[PDB]
Amino acid sequence: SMHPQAVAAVLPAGPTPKQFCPILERPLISYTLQALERVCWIKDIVVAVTGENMEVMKSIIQKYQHKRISLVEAGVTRHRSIFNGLKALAEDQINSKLSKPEVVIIHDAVRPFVEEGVLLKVVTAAKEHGAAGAIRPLVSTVVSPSADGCLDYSLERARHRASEMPQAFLFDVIYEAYQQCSDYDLEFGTECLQLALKYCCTKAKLVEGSPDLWKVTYKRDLYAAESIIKERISQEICVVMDTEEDNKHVGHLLEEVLKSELNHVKVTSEALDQCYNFVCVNVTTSDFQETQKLLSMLEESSLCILYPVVVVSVHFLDFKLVPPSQKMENLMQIREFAKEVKERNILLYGLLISYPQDDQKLQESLRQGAIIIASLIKERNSGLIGQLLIA
Amino acid sequence: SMHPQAVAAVLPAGPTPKQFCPILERPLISYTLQALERVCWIKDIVVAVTGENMEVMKSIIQKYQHKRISLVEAGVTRHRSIFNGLKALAEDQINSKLSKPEVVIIHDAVRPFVEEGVLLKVVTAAKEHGAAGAIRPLVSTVVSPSADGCLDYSLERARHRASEMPQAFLFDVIYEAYQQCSDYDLEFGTECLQLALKYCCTKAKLVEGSPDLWKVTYKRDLYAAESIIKERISQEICVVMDTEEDNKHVGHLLEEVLKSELNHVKVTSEALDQCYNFVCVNVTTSDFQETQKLLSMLEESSLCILYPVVVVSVHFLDFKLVPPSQKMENLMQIREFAKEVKERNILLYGLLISYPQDDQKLQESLRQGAIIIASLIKERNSGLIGQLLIA
Ligand SMILES: [Cl-]
Ligand SMILES: [Cl-]
Ligand SMILES: [Mg+2]
Ligand SMILES: [Mg+2]
């Protein structure tokens, strides 16, 4: 209850920039906006986009239900885009629609893994100093080429750092800096903290940042970001079951084995909240009554808007190696359901567990079940939807 | 037939460095060595490792069958490790075991995506200039902190570049540079090209490099590298079949649909060479005679040493929705085979295609088959081995 007061954010969102490149069919900028919106004390988030993209952005705001977002037109350069964002926040006009912050954050649309910690640190350092920025060590040596493309000099790696986002400023300082800024610097400047230093004699505080702060620039960064996203949504599973005592027991049985086999995963069970993996468990039918309920409940929801939701429909059934033909015929309705719910961003898979078995055989099947489920969750791959797997 | 003559390479292999971190259970350094060994004209590859790791490295050389590798002891710093590598190549002693190169390449063990192109360019520039290095543009602004951790100054992004590997030198130049180098510079220097400039007045040629040249430093770089590796081994598939005319036709049928559905994939068919994906096709039995032959042929091979090999055993069978119980019982031997060959780094999956069907139903099953196969290839995930999938 001690959150910074009067804070807003500005994102310039103007190889080619990757802010609209999809990850799991969702544009990268949407993940960044989500990460910023989760920080309750950032009152307004001002995003600069170009005219050609203004409609894509608005559609993105609607589709993913982003809150506290005000759009402004980007300039041709990054400093111009940021200035327009600050203008919109200045509350110094008849036209102004937004409270003037004390502290403003600058972030980039292609840096989706920002969290409340580093933000708090840069906001706090900026109150005390006027300006602040996240830094990282250099991995590569920096060099200066001559006109003919030969080594002129090398810089001492230990005396330099890479400037990263987020940055934060006392609003009046940075706004005043932009108002004094030469048009040359607006065109060719890359670094807001250098503006504050040159035009307001404000020496920014450099805060140490995590490896997560990097900017998505290349294809390989998109790969890395996809993986981090998929890992983070793999850490929670909800096992769902009927009130029937048979179903509750196998459901809880599976819950327990998922907990013990998948270390560092939060597993819960609900009868029949930011969870994207569901394990629906059934003994008492050769059908999908429980799974159908769960799907209809998710087809409505906005869980499916934000990330692909994985649903594993699990059936405990009596059989030696293969279940009887007629029961297997019923289970194959999974294919049809999977095809339908794929359209709503749900990935539906089936898993058969032989029940009952001898103790050790059943233990092994439960472990295999857990591994299979973890695998389907990890990969989140649409290619295997509708399959009936066996533990 | 115009390859550079008298070339050798030196790799200093001494968060914590990631050269022994596994990707697909194979250490990162092994992928780099493979990439360098593929360049035929690099006569010797000298790798510096620390004493504690000398045995791991030797084991790695044996396990993955690396050629042309000579090991030397790493120093405590990077310049010391490189000097020892050059010493071993100098051929200026009774103890010398290696031809003296005209040009030597320096590379890093944690940069596995180096290819003949950039190598040729830096070797060629180094003949003409004495020294040469790959460069990249800067993504982040570089700054200098003051003692109290505040912004001192920012560097102009457009006048600087990030120095990357590979680098190459006329041997005598760089060897002479190391022989004149102060112990301070051996301790604190990060940049071989700066050595050549300071101690031999050699201005290195800066060659433009690809985004692939980056160094694996963080967990997120390991993710990216894994993805790139898996993508590159996904571009070739071998469909394997009996001489039986029935099997040849369904095998070739599937080959053709894989070609058309998987654009930019090289697909070939062999009867029953750097391919890690096999599709074994069978109509004429409810058994795995053809697949067993293929597995035994791979259990011997060194394909499985370098990358996990994916094998999809495909059965075309008559059935409406579910195949008859007794035939399904036979197909479940797949589970047992998969468990066994997993130990030899082979990932075995099963796929059932209903045959015959009406034209359009069969077309659809073939397409789904292709998507399933592509998915299993893409992910290369051990969790789903032994499953019988249905197209
Ligand atoms: Cl402006
Ligand atoms: Cl030495
Ligand atoms: Mg600018
Ligand atoms: Mg050194």
UniProtKB/Swiss-Prot annotation, chains A, B:
Pfam families named in the record: IspD, ISPD_C
Which residue pairs form cystines in this protein? none
GO terms, molecular function: cytidylyltransferase activity; D-ribitol-5-phosphate cytidylyltransferase activity; protein homodimerization activity
Q: What is a single cellular component term in the Gene Ontology annotation?
A: cytosol
Q: Where is this site: Positions substrate for the nucleophilic attack?
A: R157, K215
Classification via CDD domains: CDP-ME_synthetase
Q: Which reaction does it catalyse?
A: D-ribitol 5-phosphate + CTP + H(+) = CDP-L-ribitol + diphosphate; D-ribose 5-phosphate + CTP + H(+) = CDP-D-ribose + diphosphate; D-ribulose 5-phosphate + CTP + H(+) = CDP-D-ribulose + diphosphate
The pathway it acts in is:
Protein modification; protein glycosylation
Keywords, A to Z, come to: Congenital muscular dystrophy, Cytoplasm, Disease variant, Dystroglycanopathy, Limb-girdle muscular dystrophy, Lissencephaly, Nucleotidyltransferase, Transferase
**PROSITE patterns in the record, alphabetically?**
ISPD
Listed under GO biological process in this entry are:
axon guidance; isoprenoid biosynthetic process; protein O-linked mannosylation
Cross-referenced InterPro entries, in alphabetical order? IspD/TarI (IPR034683), ISPD_C (IPR040635), ISPD_synthase_CS (IPR018294), Nucleotide-diphossugar_trans (IPR029044)
Protein location: Cytoplasm, Cytosol
The site (Transition state stabilizer) lies at K18
Specify the domain of life of the species encoding this protein: Eukaryota
**Tissue expression from the record:** Ubiquitously expressed, with high expression in brain.
Q: Which family does it belong to?
A: Belongs to the IspD/TarI cytidylyltransferase family. IspD subfamily.
| Subunit details | Homodimer.
Associated disorder is: Muscular dystrophy-dystroglycanopathy congenital with brain and eye anomalies A7: An autosomal recessive disorder characterized by congenital muscular dystrophy associated with cobblestone lissencephaly and other brain anomalies, eye malformations, profound intellectual disability, and death usually in the first years of life. Included diseases are the more severe Walker-Warburg syndrome and the slightly less severe muscle-eye-brain disease.
* General function of this protein: Cytidylyltransferase required for protein O-linked mannosylation. Catalyzes the formation of CDP-ribitol nucleotide sugar from D-ribitol 5-phosphate. CDP-ribitol is a substrate of FKTN during the biosynthesis of the phosphorylated O-mannosyl trisaccharide (N-acetylgalactosamine-beta-3-N-acetylglucosamine-beta-4-(phosphate-6-)mannose), a carbohydrate structure present in alpha-dystroglycan (DAG1), which is required for binding laminin G-like domain-containing extracellular proteins with high affinity.
Annotated protein name in UniProt: D-ribitol-5-phosphate cytidylyltransferase
Native organism taxonomy: Eukaryota, Metazoa, Chordata, Craniata, Vertebrata
Gene expressing this chain: CRPPA
